[PDB]
Symmetry: C2
Subunit: 129 residues, 2 copies
Protein backbone atom coordinates (compact mmCIF):
# COMPACT_ATOMS: atom_id res chain seq x y z
CA UNK A 1 0.00 0.00 0.00
CA UNK A 2 0.82 3.73 0.09
CA UNK A 3 0.03 6.92 1.85
CA UNK A 4 -2.19 8.86 -0.46
CA UNK A 5 -5.62 8.80 -1.98
CA UNK A 6 -7.55 10.58 -4.67
CA UNK A 7 -11.18 11.58 -4.17
CA UNK A 8 -13.60 13.01 -6.71
CA UNK A 9 -16.37 15.59 -6.28
CA UNK A 10 -18.90 16.44 -9.02
CA UNK A 11 -21.80 18.72 -9.98
CA UNK A 12 -24.28 16.42 -8.25
CA UNK A 13 -22.94 17.16 -4.78
CA UNK A 14 -21.21 13.85 -4.28
CA UNK A 15 -17.84 12.36 -3.52
CA UNK A 16 -16.96 9.14 -5.30
CA UNK A 17 -15.56 7.52 -2.04
CA UNK A 18 -17.46 6.83 1.18
CA UNK A 19 -14.47 5.52 3.03
CA UNK A 20 -10.75 5.99 3.05
CA UNK A 21 -8.18 3.84 4.81
CA UNK A 22 -4.77 5.16 5.88
CA UNK A 23 -2.12 2.41 6.02
CA UNK A 24 -0.42 2.05 9.43
CA UNK A 25 3.05 2.23 7.84
CA UNK A 26 2.30 5.90 6.97
CA UNK A 27 3.79 8.82 8.87
CA UNK A 28 2.09 11.33 6.46
CA UNK A 29 -1.00 10.96 4.30
CA UNK A 30 -1.92 12.95 1.21
CA UNK A 31 -5.47 13.52 0.00
CA UNK A 32 -5.89 14.66 -3.59
CA UNK A 33 -9.30 16.23 -4.20
CA UNK A 34 -10.56 16.67 -7.74
CA UNK A 35 -13.64 18.69 -8.83
CA UNK A 36 -14.79 16.71 -11.91
CA UNK A 37 -17.80 18.88 -12.72
CA UNK A 38 -17.93 22.23 -14.50
CA UNK A 39 -19.82 24.43 -12.05
CA UNK A 40 -18.25 27.55 -10.58
CA UNK A 41 -16.94 27.35 -7.02
CA UNK A 42 -19.49 30.04 -6.05
CA UNK A 43 -22.34 27.68 -7.10
CA UNK A 44 -21.03 24.14 -6.36
CA UNK A 45 -17.61 24.63 -4.71
CA UNK A 46 -16.11 21.64 -2.84
CA UNK A 47 -13.48 21.01 -0.21
CA UNK A 48 -12.53 18.04 1.99
CA UNK A 49 -12.43 18.50 5.77
CA UNK A 50 -11.29 15.97 8.34
CA UNK A 51 -12.56 15.87 11.93
CA UNK A 52 -13.63 13.58 14.74
CA UNK A 53 -17.00 12.22 13.65
CA UNK A 54 -18.38 14.08 16.60
CA UNK A 55 -17.24 17.54 15.55
CA UNK A 56 -18.72 17.16 12.02
CA UNK A 57 -21.77 19.50 12.41
CA UNK A 58 -20.08 22.11 14.64
CA UNK A 59 -17.07 22.48 12.31
CA UNK A 60 -19.55 22.48 9.40
CA UNK A 61 -21.52 25.33 11.03
CA UNK A 62 -18.59 27.48 11.99
CA UNK A 63 -17.13 26.74 8.52
CA UNK A 64 -20.23 27.99 6.67
CA UNK A 65 -19.86 31.05 8.88
CA UNK A 66 -16.19 31.63 7.88
CA UNK A 67 -16.98 32.53 4.25
CA UNK A 68 -15.44 31.54 0.93
CA UNK A 69 -12.24 33.53 1.52
CA UNK A 70 -11.56 31.14 4.50
CA UNK A 71 -12.38 28.08 2.41
CA UNK A 72 -15.54 27.62 4.55
CA UNK A 73 -13.44 26.53 7.54
CA UNK A 74 -13.12 28.61 10.66
CA UNK A 75 -9.46 29.71 10.72
CA UNK A 76 -7.44 27.88 13.39
CA UNK A 77 -10.47 25.62 14.10
CA UNK A 78 -8.74 23.10 16.37
CA UNK A 79 -11.32 20.34 15.66
CA UNK A 80 -10.03 20.27 12.09
CA UNK A 81 -7.22 17.79 11.46
CA UNK A 82 -6.87 18.78 7.80
CA UNK A 83 -8.70 20.45 4.98
CA UNK A 84 -8.21 21.49 1.37
CA UNK A 85 -9.17 24.79 -0.21
CA UNK A 86 -12.58 25.17 -1.83
CA UNK A 87 -12.23 24.42 -5.64
CA UNK A 88 -14.72 24.75 -8.58
CA UNK A 89 -15.18 22.46 -11.61
CA UNK A 90 -11.93 21.46 -13.34
CA UNK A 91 -9.61 22.09 -10.48
CA UNK A 92 -7.91 19.99 -7.85
CA UNK A 93 -6.19 20.60 -4.48
CA UNK A 94 -4.16 18.32 -2.13
CA UNK A 95 -3.58 18.32 1.59
CA UNK A 96 -0.88 16.28 3.45
CA UNK A 97 -1.34 15.64 7.16
CA UNK A 98 0.51 14.03 10.03
CA UNK A 99 -0.93 10.56 10.65
CA UNK A 100 0.19 10.96 14.32
CA UNK A 101 -2.93 13.17 14.67
CA UNK A 102 -5.09 10.06 14.18
CA UNK A 103 -5.86 7.52 16.87
CA UNK A 104 -5.89 3.90 15.73
CA UNK A 105 -9.31 2.27 15.91
CA UNK A 106 -11.04 5.65 16.04
CA UNK A 107 -13.27 6.92 13.24
CA UNK A 108 -13.16 10.12 11.42
CA UNK A 109 -15.56 12.03 9.36
CA UNK A 110 -14.46 13.75 6.16
CA UNK A 111 -17.02 16.08 4.53
CA UNK A 112 -17.50 19.11 2.31
CA UNK A 113 -18.10 22.26 4.37
CA UNK A 114 -19.25 24.45 1.46
CA UNK A 115 -22.78 25.70 2.51
CA UNK A 116 -25.31 22.86 2.67
CA UNK A 117 -22.99 20.18 1.21
CA UNK A 118 -22.12 18.34 4.42
CA UNK A 119 -25.49 16.55 4.34
CA UNK A 120 -24.65 14.75 1.11
CA UNK A 121 -20.78 14.85 0.92
CA UNK A 122 -19.53 12.80 3.87
CA UNK A 123 -17.37 9.68 4.35
CA UNK A 124 -15.35 7.80 6.92
CA UNK A 125 -11.63 7.71 7.41
CA UNK A 126 -9.88 5.05 9.51
CA UNK A 127 -6.32 4.01 10.23
CA UNK A 128 -5.75 0.25 9.38
CA UNK A 129 -3.17 -2.49 8.40
Amino acid sequence: AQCEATIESNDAMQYNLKEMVVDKSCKQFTVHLKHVGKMAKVAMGHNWVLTKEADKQGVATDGMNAGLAQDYVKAGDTRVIAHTKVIGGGESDSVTFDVSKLTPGEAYAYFCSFPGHWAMMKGTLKLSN
Copy 2:
Protein backbone atom coordinates in the same frame (compact mmCIF):
# COMPACT_ATOMS: atom_id res chain seq x y z
CA ALA B 1 -58.32 24.87 -15.09
CA GLN B 2 -57.05 25.79 -11.66
CA CYS B 3 -54.90 28.52 -10.30
CA GLU B 4 -52.93 26.13 -8.15
CA ALA B 5 -49.95 23.81 -8.59
CA THR B 6 -48.14 21.28 -6.36
CA ILE B 7 -44.37 20.94 -6.65
CA GLU B 8 -42.39 18.20 -4.82
CA SER B 9 -38.89 18.47 -3.40
CA ASN B 10 -36.82 15.52 -2.18
CA ASP B 11 -33.68 14.27 -0.49
CA ALA B 12 -31.73 14.45 -3.76
CA MET B 13 -32.16 18.22 -4.01
CA GLN B 14 -34.54 18.18 -6.90
CA TYR B 15 -37.88 19.71 -7.54
CA ASN B 16 -40.13 17.45 -9.60
CA LEU B 17 -41.03 20.39 -11.93
CA LYS B 18 -38.67 22.49 -14.00
CA GLU B 19 -41.26 24.85 -15.41
CA MET B 20 -44.57 26.12 -14.00
CA VAL B 21 -47.26 27.91 -16.03
CA VAL B 22 -49.81 30.25 -14.47
CA ASP B 23 -53.07 30.44 -16.46
CA LYS B 24 -54.12 33.93 -17.60
CA SER B 25 -57.58 33.11 -16.23
CA CYS B 26 -56.18 33.37 -12.69
CA LYS B 27 -56.43 36.43 -10.46
CA GLN B 28 -54.42 34.59 -7.84
CA PHE B 29 -52.10 31.62 -7.80
CA THR B 30 -51.22 29.09 -5.09
CA VAL B 31 -48.10 26.96 -4.92
CA HIS B 32 -48.14 23.92 -2.66
CA LEU B 33 -44.65 22.75 -1.82
CA LYS B 34 -44.25 19.19 -0.46
CA HIS B 35 -40.96 17.76 0.90
CA VAL B 36 -41.37 14.04 0.10
CA GLY B 37 -37.96 13.11 1.43
CA LYS B 38 -37.15 11.87 4.89
CA MET B 39 -34.35 14.36 5.82
CA ALA B 40 -34.91 17.06 8.52
CA LYS B 41 -34.83 20.75 7.56
CA VAL B 42 -31.51 21.21 9.34
CA ALA B 43 -29.81 19.02 6.70
CA MET B 44 -32.04 19.23 3.59
CA GLY B 45 -34.56 22.01 4.17
CA HIS B 46 -36.41 23.25 1.08
CA ASN B 47 -38.40 26.41 0.31
CA TRP B 48 -39.80 27.86 -2.97
CA VAL B 49 -38.89 31.48 -3.78
CA LEU B 50 -39.99 33.42 -6.84
CA THR B 51 -38.06 36.30 -8.36
CA LYS B 52 -37.17 37.91 -11.65
CA GLU B 53 -34.48 35.81 -13.30
CA ALA B 54 -31.96 38.52 -12.65
CA ASP B 55 -32.60 38.74 -8.87
CA LYS B 56 -31.95 34.99 -8.26
CA GLN B 57 -28.28 35.12 -7.07
CA GLY B 58 -28.75 38.28 -4.93
CA VAL B 59 -31.89 37.00 -3.22
CA ALA B 60 -30.19 33.59 -2.64
CA THR B 61 -27.09 35.22 -1.12
CA ASP B 62 -29.00 37.56 1.04
CA GLY B 63 -31.50 34.85 2.05
CA MET B 64 -28.50 32.74 3.13
CA ASN B 65 -27.44 35.40 5.63
CA ALA B 66 -30.97 35.71 7.12
CA GLY B 67 -30.82 32.23 8.78
CA LEU B 68 -33.15 29.25 9.15
CA ALA B 69 -35.63 31.00 11.48
CA GLN B 70 -36.13 33.55 8.69
CA ASP B 71 -36.74 30.76 6.13
CA TYR B 72 -33.45 31.79 4.43
CA VAL B 73 -35.10 34.81 2.84
CA LYS B 74 -34.28 38.33 3.93
CA ALA B 75 -37.40 39.96 5.51
CA GLY B 76 -38.99 42.61 3.31
CA ASP B 77 -36.79 41.52 0.32
CA THR B 78 -38.49 43.54 -2.44
CA ARG B 79 -37.03 41.22 -5.06
CA VAL B 80 -39.08 38.33 -3.73
CA ILE B 81 -42.53 38.11 -5.37
CA ALA B 82 -43.52 35.17 -3.14
CA HIS B 83 -41.95 32.44 -0.96
CA THR B 84 -42.93 29.51 1.30
CA LYS B 85 -41.34 28.69 4.65
CA VAL B 86 -38.36 26.27 4.74
CA ILE B 87 -39.87 22.72 5.34
CA GLY B 88 -38.35 19.32 6.19
CA GLY B 89 -39.23 15.81 5.08
CA GLY B 90 -42.87 14.87 5.53
CA GLU B 91 -44.07 18.52 5.61
CA SER B 92 -45.74 20.99 3.25
CA ASP B 93 -46.30 24.72 2.88
CA SER B 94 -48.51 26.77 0.54
CA VAL B 95 -48.14 30.32 -0.76
CA THR B 96 -50.68 32.41 -2.63
CA PHE B 97 -49.79 35.55 -4.60
CA ASP B 98 -51.23 38.08 -7.07
CA VAL B 99 -51.09 37.19 -10.69
CA SER B 100 -51.06 40.89 -11.47
CA LYS B 101 -47.51 40.92 -10.07
CA LEU B 102 -46.39 38.95 -13.10
CA THR B 103 -45.85 40.32 -16.53
CA PRO B 104 -47.13 38.40 -19.50
CA GLY B 105 -44.19 37.25 -21.59
CA GLU B 106 -41.69 37.34 -18.71
CA ALA B 107 -39.65 34.47 -17.33
CA TYR B 108 -39.39 34.20 -13.58
CA ALA B 109 -37.02 31.98 -11.60
CA TYR B 110 -38.28 29.82 -8.71
CA PHE B 111 -35.53 28.25 -6.56
CA CYS B 112 -34.67 26.89 -3.14
CA SER B 113 -32.65 29.48 -1.03
CA PHE B 114 -31.51 27.02 1.64
CA PRO B 115 -27.65 27.26 1.71
CA GLY B 116 -26.16 25.78 -1.44
CA HIS B 117 -29.47 24.59 -2.93
CA TRP B 118 -30.10 27.19 -5.68
CA ALA B 119 -27.51 25.70 -8.02
CA MET B 120 -29.59 22.56 -8.14
CA MET B 121 -33.23 23.54 -7.25
CA LYS B 122 -34.37 26.00 -9.83
CA GLY B 123 -37.11 26.22 -12.49
CA THR B 124 -38.98 28.70 -14.61
CA LEU B 125 -42.37 30.23 -14.06
CA LYS B 126 -44.37 32.21 -16.68
CA LEU B 127 -47.87 33.24 -17.70
CA SER B 128 -49.84 31.07 -20.13
CA ASN B 129 -49.57 31.83 -23.88
